[PDB]
Amino acid sequence: VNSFSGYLKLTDNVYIKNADIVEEAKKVKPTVVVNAANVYLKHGGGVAGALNKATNNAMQVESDDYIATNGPLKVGGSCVLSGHNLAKHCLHVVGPNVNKGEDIQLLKSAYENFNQHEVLLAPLLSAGIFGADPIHSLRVCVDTVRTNVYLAVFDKNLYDKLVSSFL
Ligand SMILES: O=S(=O)(Nc1nncs1)c1ccccc1
């Protein structure tokens, strides 16, 4: 038993909710919250901008030190950093950005990072400002992640479409 509440069960291991990932993280304090990161860990907008704002910019300060030491992530890659006030850890995962021309086949590689963590609270990867077909993102998630993933989907209309169209 875990602390996640109000989720629809899609599969043995994938759960979905019409909830604010920021508000959900603040309520649950999960072991891992996933950020929809870019390779520079520049948390300007979308999920990343919202998570970073909720940390009072501490996520960005930590991330700038990480990049100054290690250089950029790979598209499809990840790093584990602090979860600050939101979670124990933040798994920063880089899905491909369609609005930058990145290979959508890298979405499966992105979701494979989730398998290193037993339980995660996560954004549908490459949805919102990343612009990938979202329905597609949920299918890759279900077909790739084997650990227990709680997908907080804040956009309501989209939530209802994801549920209604789910095979
Ligand atoms: O793309 S979002 O930034 N995803 C997020 N989920 N939780 C917090 S932000 C977003 C923000 C506002 C409305 C709809 C979507």
UniProtKB/Swiss-Prot annotation:
Function as written in the Swiss-Prot or TrEMBL entry: Responsible for the cleavages located at the N-terminus of the replicase polyprotein. Participates together with nsp4 in the assembly of virally-induced cytoplasmic double-membrane vesicles necessary for viral replication. Antagonizes innate immune induction of type I interferon by blocking the phosphorylation, dimerization and subsequent nuclear translocation of host IRF3. Also prevents host NF-kappa-B signaling. In addition, PL-PRO possesses a deubiquitinating/deISGylating activity and processes both 'Lys-48'- and 'Lys-63'-linked polyubiquitin chains from cellular substrates.
Description of how activity is regulated = Inhibited in vitro by GRL-0617.
Query: What quaternary structure, including any partners, is listed in this protein's UniProt entry?
Result: May form homohexamers. Interacts with N protein.
Q: Where in the cell is it found?
A: Host endoplasmic reticulum membrane
Report what the protein is called. Answer: Papain-like protease nsp3
> What reaction does this enzyme carry out catalytically?
Thiol-dependent hydrolysis of ester, thioester, amide, peptide and isopeptide bonds formed by the C-terminal Gly of ubiquitin (a 76-residue protein attached to proteins as an intracellular targeting signal)
Q: Which residues of the full protein are shown?
A: 1025 to 1191 of 7096
Please tell me the species this chain comes from. Answer: Severe acute respiratory syndrome coronavirus 2
Per the record, membrane topology reads:
Multi-pass membrane protein
Origin: domain of life = Viruses
Where the record annotates domain Macro, the positions are: 1-167
